[PDB]
């Protein structure tokens, strides 16, 4: 069948009996009454009693041993779908394949009905989850401490071409993995003041909100280790009256939803409890767990990690625990905290960085925003003597930022109070030393390191695309799976007729797979002999689906100039949600279904190009359409993309790559050699050099008669009959105040974009650049960037050796 | 020793005791006062004898099967030397070494003493030489027509960094291989008036000028053909008496010196007379030759190719023939002209074209403006006719150009009188359809054709490449030698260690030679492991010697910049002559020594740059440094550059190149693959949009930090102390009427040069690249494009059966 393990007779047996066995007494249901939902919890439960013995033999493992704790918190974890992928790292594929078949159904079909847990935005919490596994994998005493939102990101749905947003009630039916630990319920305090008596200070008349906490198990890739993700849900505490009742609901808000934007800073109230939500009961499990294991070796058995500022109050609330809770002297404890946390970066837009004004933080945490002016005080103090008489570094480096209204810079909060501090790609980590973070790096520059992205392998290759991951094992065994390196063994495959016509043959398959779900979900046809030019992430400028947008617009327009010409065949792609308050976003959205709406009914255009937008993009969503793709685009302007990870999945999966100069865009070409990469595009140099000069969007509409042809048809009403200025918006932007300079890549962009068709009309050169792509993505795997978090920052060694079954 | 043949006893002894037979008898010399001049001659009349009874029965054998003949007119032959050249197409090399090494000298010593036959300015005047060797190698009838200049082109020093002329007295030791034939002379007439009278025209009242034939043999590679290449001297006729004897060196004067014009032209009479005078006399011996075989089947006899414009007169002297003599009518005489005249053009560039004014031909000739004249007319009746009321169409077609002076246009007049007109390069001759001769298409679309240039394998590899040609025979065998296409088979061989290895080695050993060579006959020195990066062609501004310049300078300033950094060692080299009165060429030249004067002594450089001007380039000179080259710099503005052959031989060699998609370069590139080559700059279509808009120099200035520092390096003095303003009409030039647009194309060069110094670093790539150049050269052989002329111009068969011994 595949290498989805094996399907022993005493194991299918086993299989399909407790799955019977749930189905009646945990479902309470007959094979005359249960409907596919039913079937689906059936096997659900099957496969976790699988691994709670793991999970419970593990955590007793780390109580014997007592090695250093790993706390990554993050306000978000991206999970997907946890049955598949737990049944792949427990080795089960194959056995509940034929248990569930031997019972009359189709696997599959089941899977597709379990909810994601999209308890994440993009990047950052597809990060966090490619991480918790690779832990796992590693063998690290590692914990995931987040939020457990009752609604994760908003289902995208799309009406008369604009996007709609509806709640995302994922646990509606249940959560099968999950298990609520009441017992272990801790209290958060809010408001109050503070007061200021013979032995230290006070935080008194507070509110009081009660974190429970719910674990799910992270296995890792056949190694029976299990770890534990612990997720915090808000309960009030039980202390008019129907009034009264009600209103629990107040506190209860806390955990009910995901703050939707990715890249872009909301100072709500309501996300600022959430992040203290999170900080405060983490640290007090963290602190509980050690006293059981002097705080002096504190650090030497925790290890948190910052996934960007959204945590951040870790810093004063593990100082205000250590001061005013178990009376260290201030150095001491800054000691402690300073060593025990780090900081990883993951944006350098001004918009998107944190900064708390001031008069929340007084109301809301009174003792936080003293011990962050006292931390502030003594930081300054570091850097005055350090660079006497530069008083405008003194002000560049506070952590409190003056003007209209006060506010706390989190960022430079994170910097001081963390031992390390990382960007997420070689360029990005370069760029935060150059210019956001320049005064930081000057003053301490062994905090500033890198750790460059990656993803799991399981998931995003033996999970998502087994037909690939089958033929690569046919011809270098199955180490590679937890060892991507290996993948450069197929170097030695590149001119091997048969491996060159298999990995073909799969991507054919894929596509076949994807052209019918389209169909199947969505009901509009596409041609499976096109190139698959895809785009999928976030909605938003500095990503510039409109680039694409405009080489879209440019193809149509050169086909209707002469329609008997032959062009490569191409079903473009694109998909992703916007921030439901990002108008500019949504505009986009509306552009490409406009643009869908004309290309996709002229007759003159026949099968030759399709437009398509991909909704409700979500994990789920990226394990079908990725396998599937022939081109990626990672086009960000250079210097704004971080990393980017959905440009490493691509390249793992067989697509070539189209993009810029930009975050991980720059390692991979470089791995991969840049004659297999379609570059493109000004480099970081030539935007700050543009910069310098002043961008003007109307040169390039003046001297290119391409160009100017499609803002004329934008601005006209061509893909807006009924409503002519509909796009105004688009083009003013386009036009006076750009600031991803998209006209500037233009020409560059559509004479690569050439490039790429050409080389697709050569099946056996195209495939050659594939494998030498999918041959050079081994440094890309997270297992590699997580091994260097634990050698580099928390100071821990990896281990491969499988637990005591 | 190599397949240069076979070293038979029997042979080796017989080239002995005729090389003592020819130093005694021949050139009354003995053992004991020959110099090597002397026994350079002495092995010259020894291979020459090898070759007279080819040369006879060849002739014979024409005159007995009197097959269809090829008559190529040129005012240029750009021969070179024929010693080792003869050698090899007579399989005699091997033997002759072995010859000379037993009687105690050194045959490549003896080699280097014979003189250039330097009858030929530059590419036109070598594709008419590399033709002479293929239409002998494909057995065709043919003879090449021209002027035996007793001065060739000038012998180029550099004194003071500037290019001083010197008179090619070529044949100062006289030439053993060219036979006068005195008894052959023809009479050519010049001035005189037209009497009208009764039965026709009469042409009477004319000086006359004696036309002697020295005719040169052109052997064919290993078939025994030897064909003949007939070049008209001119002489005085013989009938104060001192002063009238002294004179007669007014009427010799027309052989006298070859005009040095590469690409331009100047209306002076001299050059008019040199004109006819190969034309008229060429002419009557065509027809003598006919006549011995009704002029109704003279077209299927005879086939005239007009080698430019430069034998134009051609047309119009064979209707006068024809009409004034052999009294046929003028319909009649017509069609035969032009069914047996066709016209090749080399070039788009206006002042190139020839325009001779009215007043000289009415003086000169005035028969033959009689005759222009009605051709025009008859012609400009059928374009009325054809465009009825197209009144400027009647204009722009005309042959005579109104204004300030009346001119003839000769190209027009070869398009009218010619049944087939080429271009030389696939871009070329598109160019020539769309602009110059756009009228001329739409009136006769028939006429107008593609014959893309090409080299002859034999000098261009076997000859001066012996060590390539060997390790490539080894392989695949040498009947590629004539079959160039068979080097596609080296494409299975990309992989072979043995062979990367043994191609790498040649070049190697190729540097080491040249570099060796460079201290011998300059003295001056040179890096070895360097990349040689050569531009060897004649200097002109669209050629681009400057924009090279610009790159160097862009080297050696950033050495400057950052001294510890490590780059690529590079030997740029550039060499070629400008002509005598073009200023700005001269300016050039002086510009690239005084870069190397500040370049080449500066210590912080050391020996990772230098910059050397190659002095007197020339066929001898090219056969050492092209072999040698790892780079070839063809660079000239997209559209300028008809088509180039010297890039074709850098190809063959093993050199990568950098070009712009202009003249062959695109074809080239189209054999090898993109990715095999270097392309960079403005396409033809991005020059047209650069003109439509208007080029400004100063934008480039202005955006370019690095392109201002040189320009003000070059202005303020740098490169000349002494005289701060020498290069003050350089930049003039560069910033207010470049017609080139050097700076247009700077940026995207320069980025360019940083790839091919990345590969250049990879060894084994760079080589595999190579390989994959050399093994696609094949299409550029003359082999080809004479078998294309031959079969879809002058309607012959060409023929590989070797002669009867
Ligand atoms: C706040 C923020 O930057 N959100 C976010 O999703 N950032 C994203 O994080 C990813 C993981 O590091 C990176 O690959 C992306 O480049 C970055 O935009
Ligand atoms: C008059 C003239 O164009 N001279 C000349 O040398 N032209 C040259 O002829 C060569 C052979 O066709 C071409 O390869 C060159 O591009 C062209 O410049
Ligand atoms: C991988 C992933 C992302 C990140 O994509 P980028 O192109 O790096 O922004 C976002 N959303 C989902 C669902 C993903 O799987
Ligand atoms: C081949 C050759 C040329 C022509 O070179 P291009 O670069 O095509 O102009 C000119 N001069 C000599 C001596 C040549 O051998």
Same mark, same amino acid.
């Given at each position: 069948?595949?290498?989805?393990?094996?399907?022993?007779?005493?194991?299918?047996?086993?299989?399909?009996?407790?799955?019977?066995?749930?189905?009646?007494?945990?479902?309470?249901?007959?094979?005359?009454?249960?409907?596919?939902?039913?079937?689906?919890?059936?096997?659900?439960?099957?496969?976790?009693?699988?691994?709670?013995?793991?999970?419970?033999?593990?955590?007793?493992?780390?109580?014997?041993?007592?090695?250093?704790?790993?706390?990554?918190?993050?306000?978000?974890?991206?999970?997907?779908? #946890?049955?598949?992928?737990?049944?792949?790292?427990?080795?089960?594929?194959?056995?509940?394949? /034929?248990?569930?078949?031997?019972?009359?159904?189709?696997?599959?079909?089941?899977?597709?009905?379990?909810?994601?847990?999209?308890?994440?935005?993009?990047?950052?919490?597809?990060?966090?989850?490619?991480?918790?596994?690779?832990?796992?994998?590693?063998?690290?005493?590692?914990?995931?401490?987040?939020?457990?939102?009752?609604?994760?990101?908003?289902?995208?749905?799309?009406?008369?071409?604009? @996007?709609?947003?509806?709640?995302?009630?994922?646990?509606?039916?249940?959560?099968?993995?999950?298990?609520?630990?009441?017992?272990?319920?801790?209290?958060?305090?809010?408001?109050?003041?503070?007061?200021?008596?013979? *032995?230290?200070?006070?935080?008194?008349?507070?509110?009081?909100?009660?974190?429970?906490?719910?674990?799910?198990?992270?296995?890792?890739?056949?190694?029976?280790?299990?770890? #534990?993700?612990?997720?915090?849900?808000?309960?009030?505490?039980?202390?008019?009256?129907?009034?009264?009742?009600?209103?629990?609901?107040?506190?209860?808000?806390?955990?009910?939803?995901?703050?939707?934007?990715?890249?872009?800073?909301?100072?709500?109230?309501?996300?600022?409890?959430?992040?203290?939500?999170?900080?405060?009961?983490?640290? *007090?499990?963290?602190?509980?767990?050690?006293?059981?294991?002097?705080?002096?070796?504190?650090?030497?058995?925790?290890?948190?990690?910052?996934?960007?500022? %959204?945590?951040?109050?870790?810093?004063?609330?593990?100082?205000?625990?250590?001061?005013?809770?178990?009376?260290?002297?201030?150095?001491?404890?800054?000691?402690?905290?300073?060593?025990?946390?780090?900081?990883?970066?993951?944006?350098?837009?001004?918009?998107?960085?944190?900064?708390?004004?001031?008069?929340?933080?007084? #109301?809301?945490?009174?003792? %936080?925003? *003293?011990?962050?002016?006292?931390?502030?005080?003594?930081?300054?103090?570091?850097?005055?003597?350090?660079?006497?008489?530069?008083?405008?570094?003194?002000?560049?480096?506070?952590?409190?930022?003056?003007?209209?209204?006060?506010?706390?810079?989190?960022?430079?909060?994170?910097?001081?109070?963390?031992?390390?501090?990382?960007?997420?790609?070689?360029?990005?980590?370069?760029?935060?030393?150059?210019?956001?973070?320049?005064?930081?790096?000057?003053?301490?520059?062994?905090?500033?390191?890198?750790?460059?992205?990656?993803?799991?392998?399981?998931?995003?290759?033996?999970?998502?695309?087994?037909?690939?991951?089958?033929?690569?094992?046919?011809?270098?065994?199955?180490?590679?799976?937890? =060892?991507?390196?290996?993948?450069?063994?197929?170097?030695?495959?590149?001119? =091997? /007729?048969?491996?060159?016509?298999?990995?073909?043959?799969?991507?054919?398959?894929?596509?076949?797979?994807?052209?019918?779900?389209?169909?199947?979900?969505?009901?509009?046809?596409?041609?499976?002999?096109?190139?698959?030019?895809? @785009?999928?992430?976030?909605?938003?400028?500095?990503?510039?689906?409109?680039?694409?947008?405009?080489?879209?617009?440019?193809?149509?327009?050169?086909?209707?100039?002469?329609?008997?010409?032959?062009?490569?065949?191409?079903?473009?792609?694109?998909?992703?949600?916007?921030?439901?308050?990002?108008?500019?976003?949504?505009?986009?959205?509306?552009?490409?279904?406009?643009?869908?709406?004309?290309?996709? %009914?002229?007759?003159?255009?026949?099968?030759?190009?399709?437009?398509?937008?991909?909704?409700?993009?979500?994990?789920?969503?990226?394990?079908?359409?990725?396998?599937?793709?022939?081109?990626?685009?990672?086009?960000?302007?250079?210097? #704004?993309?971080?990393?980017?990870?959905?440009?490493?999945?691509?390249?793992?999966?067989?697509?070539?790559?189209?993009?810029?100069?930009?975050?991980?865009?720059?390692?991979?070409?470089?791995?991969?050699?840049?004659?297999?990469?379609?570059?493109?595009?000004?480099?970081?140099?030539?935007?700050?050099?543009?910069?310098?000069?002043?961008?003007?969007?109307?040169?390039?509409? =003046?001297?290119?008669?391409?160009?100017?042809?499609?803002?004329?048809?934008?601005?006209?009403?061509?893909?807006?009959?009924? @409503?002519?200025?509909?796009?105004?918006?688009?083009?003013?932007?386009?036009?006076?105040?750009?600031?991803?300079?998209?006209?500037?890549?233009?020409?560059?962009?559509?004479?690569? *974009?050439?490039?790429?068709?050409?080389?697709?009309?050569?099946?056996?050169?195209?495939?050659?650049?594939?494998?030498?792509?999918?041959?050079?993505?081994?440094?890309?795997?997270?297992?590699?960037?997580?091994? @260097?978090?634990?050698?580099?920052?928390?100071?821990?060694?990896?281990?491969?050796?499988?637990?005591?079954?």
């Amino acid at each position: 069948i595949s290498v989805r393990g094996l399907a022993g007779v005493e194991n299918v047996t086993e299989l399909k009996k407790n799955f019977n066995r749930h189905l009646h007494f945990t479902l309470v249901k007959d094979r005359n009454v249960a409907t596919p939902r039913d079937y689906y919890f059936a096997l659900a439960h099957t496969v976790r009693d699988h691994l709670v013995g793991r999970w419970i033999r593990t955590q007793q493992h780390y109580y014997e041993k007592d090695p250093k704790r790993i706390y990554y918190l993050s306000l978000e974890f991206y999970m997907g779908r #946890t049955l598949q992928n737990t049944m792949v790292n427990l080795a089960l594929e194959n056995a509940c394949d /034929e248990a569930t078949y031997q019972l009359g159904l189709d696997m599959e079909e089941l899977e597709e009905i379990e909810e994601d847990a999209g308890l994440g935005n993009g990047g950052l919490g597809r990060l966090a989850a490619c991480f918790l596994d690779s832990m796992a994998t590693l063998g690290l005493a590692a914990y995931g401490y987040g939020i457990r939102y009752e609604f994760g990101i908003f289902n995208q749905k799309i009406c008369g071409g604009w @996007q709609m947003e509806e709640a995302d009630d994922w646990l509606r039916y249940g959560n099968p993995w999950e298990k609520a630990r009441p017992e272990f319920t801790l209290p958060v305090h809010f408001y109050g003041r503070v007061e200021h008596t013979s *032995q230290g200070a006070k935080w008194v008349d507070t509110q009081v909100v009660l974190a429970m906490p719910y674990d799910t198990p992270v296995p890792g890739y056949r190694n029976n280790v299990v770890n #534990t993700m612990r997720l915090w849900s808000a309960k009030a505490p039980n202390d008019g009256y129907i009034q009264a009742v009600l209103d629990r609901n107040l506190a209860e808000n806390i955990s009910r939803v995901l703050y939707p934007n990715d890249n872009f800073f909301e100072g709500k109230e309501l996300r600022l409890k959430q992040e203290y939500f999170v900080v405060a009961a983490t640290l *007090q499990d963290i602190i509980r767990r050690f006293k059981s294991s002097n705080f002096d070796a504190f650090p030497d058995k925790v290890a948190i990690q910052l996934n960007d500022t %959204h945590p951040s109050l870790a810093i004063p609330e593990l100082m205000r625990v250590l001061v005013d809770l178990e009376r260290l002297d201030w150095d001491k404890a800054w000691e402690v905290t300073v060593k025990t946390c780090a900081y990883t970066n993951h944006t350098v837009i001004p918009e998107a960085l944190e900064r708390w004004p001031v008069h929340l933080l007084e #109301t809301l945490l009174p003792r %936080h925003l *003293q011990i962050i002016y006292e931390i502030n005080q003594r930081f300054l103090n570091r850097v005055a003597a350090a660079f006497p008489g530069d008083v405008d570094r003194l002000r560049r480096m506070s952590l409190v930022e003056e003007g209209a209204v006060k506010r706390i810079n989190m960022a430079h909060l994170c910097i001081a109070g963390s031992h390390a501090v990382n960007g997420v790609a070689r360029i990005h980590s370069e760029i935060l030393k150059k210019t956001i973070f320049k005064d930081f790096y000057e003053l301490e520059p062994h905090k500033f390191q890198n750790k460059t992205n990656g993803i799991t392998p399981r998931r995003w290759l033996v999970l998502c695309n087994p037909g690939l991951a089958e033929i690569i094992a046919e011809r270098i065994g199955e180490e590679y799976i937890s =060892d991507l390196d290996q993948l450069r063994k197929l170097l030695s495959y590149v001119d =091997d /007729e048969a491996f060159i016509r298999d990995v073909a043959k799969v991507k054919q398959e894929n596509k076949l797979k994807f052209a019918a779900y389209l169909e199947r979900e969505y009901k509009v046809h596409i041609n499976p002999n096109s190139l698959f030019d895809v @785009q999928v992430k976030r909605i938003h400028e500095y990503k510039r689906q409109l680039l694409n947008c405009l080489h879209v617009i440019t193809l149509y327009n050169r086909i209707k100039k002469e329609p008997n010409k032959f062009v490569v065949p191409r079903t473009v792609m694109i998909g992703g949600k916007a921030a439901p308050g990002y108008h500019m976003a949504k505009m986009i959205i509306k552009l490409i279904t406009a643009i869908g709406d004309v290309v996709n %009914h002229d007759p003159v255009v026949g099968d030759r190009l399709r437009v398509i937008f991909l909704e409700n993009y979500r994990v789920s969503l990226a394990e079908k359409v990725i396998p599937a793709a022939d081109l990626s685009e990672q086009i960000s302007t250079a210097g #704004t993309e971080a990393s980017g990870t959905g440009n490493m999945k691509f390249m793992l999966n067989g697509a070539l790559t189209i993009g810029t100069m930009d975050g991980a865009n720059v390692e991979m070409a470089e791995e991969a050699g840049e004659e297999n990469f379609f570059i493109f595009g000004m480099r970081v140099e030539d935007v700050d050099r543009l910069d310098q000069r002043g961008y003007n969007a109307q040169e390039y509409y =003046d001297r290119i008669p391409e160009l100017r042809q499609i803002i004329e048809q934008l601005s006209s009403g061509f893909f807006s009959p009924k @409503q002519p200025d509909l796009f105004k918006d688009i083009v003013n932007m386009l036009m006076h105040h750009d600031r991803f300079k998209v006209f500037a890549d233009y020409e560059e962009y559509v004479k690569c *974009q050439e490039r790429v068709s050409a080389l697709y009309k050569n099946p056996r050169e195209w495939t050659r650049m594939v494998i030498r792509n999918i041959a050079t993505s081994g440094k890309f795997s997270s297992d590699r960037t997580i091994a @260097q978090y634990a050698r580099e920052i928390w100071g821990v060694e990896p281990s491969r050796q499988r637990l005591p079954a």
